[PDB]
Design a protein around this ligand. Sequence first.
Ligand code: ZN
Ligand code: ZN
Ligand code: ZN
Ligand code: ZN
Lengths: 10, 76, 81
Amino acid sequence: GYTEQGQEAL
Amino acid sequence: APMITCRVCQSLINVEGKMHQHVVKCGVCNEATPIKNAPPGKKYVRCPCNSLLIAKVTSQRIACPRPYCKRIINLG
Amino acid sequence: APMITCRVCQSLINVEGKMHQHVVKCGVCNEATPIKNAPPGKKYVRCPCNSLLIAKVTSQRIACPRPYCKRIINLGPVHPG
Ligand SMILES: [Zn+2]
Ligand SMILES: [Zn+2]
Ligand SMILES: [Zn+2]
Ligand SMILES: [Zn+2]
C-alpha cells in the first residue's frame, strides 16, 4: 500500500 | 506481418522481430501496449494521460513522470 | 468542453485534456484523427477503409495494414522503370 515514482514501460 | 492492436489509439502495431519484448510502441500515438504479462513483482499501470507505466506489486499509488501530467494514480 | 467533429462518423470527440496527444480516437467509430502535425519527414494518409496511416513524405505508396483491407495507396505519379 505504498507510493512509488512511476517508470515508463517505454 | 504479425500485428497487435494499440490499446490507446487502436492503430495496428507491427511486432515482427519484437515478440521477445514485453511492450511495443505505437507509431501513431507513440504510446506503449503490452504483448506479454508484466515481469514477476511488477504490474502494468495505464495513466489517464495514456502513458504505460511499470510499477511494483507493493505500490498502491503511482506518480506519473510525464511533465504535463504528474497525476497520482490510486490502484485500490 | 472542447469538441471536434469526427470526419469519419460525424460524432463529437471530446478533446478536453487531450490536446497533449498526437491523435484522438473517436469513441463511436474508433478511428483516429490527428490533432498535431505529423512528425518531421512524415505525413498522415487516411485509407479508404478509414484507417489512419503514417508515411514518409517521400513515399510514393503505402499499404494499409488491416487484413480485411490491405489496400495499396498510390500517393503520386512515378517515373518509368
Ligand atoms: Zn497508438
Ligand atoms: Zn500520466
Ligand atoms: Zn468517429
Ligand atoms: Zn485500409
